[PDB]
Ligand binder design. Sequence first.
Ligand SMILES: [Ca+2]
Ligand SMILES: [Ca+2]
Ligand SMILES: [Ca+2]
Ligand SMILES: [Ca+2]
Lengths: 149, 48
Amino acid sequence: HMADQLTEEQIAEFKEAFSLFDKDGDGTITTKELGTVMRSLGQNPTEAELQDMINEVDADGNGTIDFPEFLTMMARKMKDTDSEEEIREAFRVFDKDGNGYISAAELRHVMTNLGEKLTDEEVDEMIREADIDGDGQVNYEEFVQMMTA
Amino acid sequence: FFQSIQALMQTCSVLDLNAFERQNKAEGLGMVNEDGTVINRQNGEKVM
Ligand SMILES: [Ca+2]
Ligand SMILES: [Ca+2]
Ligand SMILES: [Ca+2]
Ligand SMILES: [Ca+2]
């Protein structure tokens, strides 16, 4: 949903961008309006591709781009940036310091913040399971292949 | 009066396993809202 993907500030910024394209203010983006801003940016496209880049996001097929369609375009662009990198943030939650290894103390820190509590001994049980190298720290490579700590 | 009473009694709900099964899956998803985050919203029970 747009509320999940976009914040109030981003919606305001997109509206200003939409109004930059819509010099008329009627609420729709025509080919000439889209072509004008492209020339200001240096590009000189033809109407054949200019229509194509409109039809690619025009939902109702009226031939013009309104704000609901403009927001829907930007909502997809924000969403599809992250595809499978969600494990990177999950790794950094356990990795407080910022290096490439998860320490037992760092695993204690996240477990302390979470509801479940450890008796300072079973923390070694799952870290040695995740850490195959046996160095006492779980790196990023060990975390993605199998997640226990 | 009695036609209304009889109709009301026929619309009274009983234990529905299909509704119960749906709720168990629904509570297992753990949904949240956009503006902030709701902790397992307690919207109306659908079993009786
Ligand atoms: Ca216009
Ligand atoms: Ca349209
Ligand atoms: Ca670390
Ligand atoms: Ca290791």
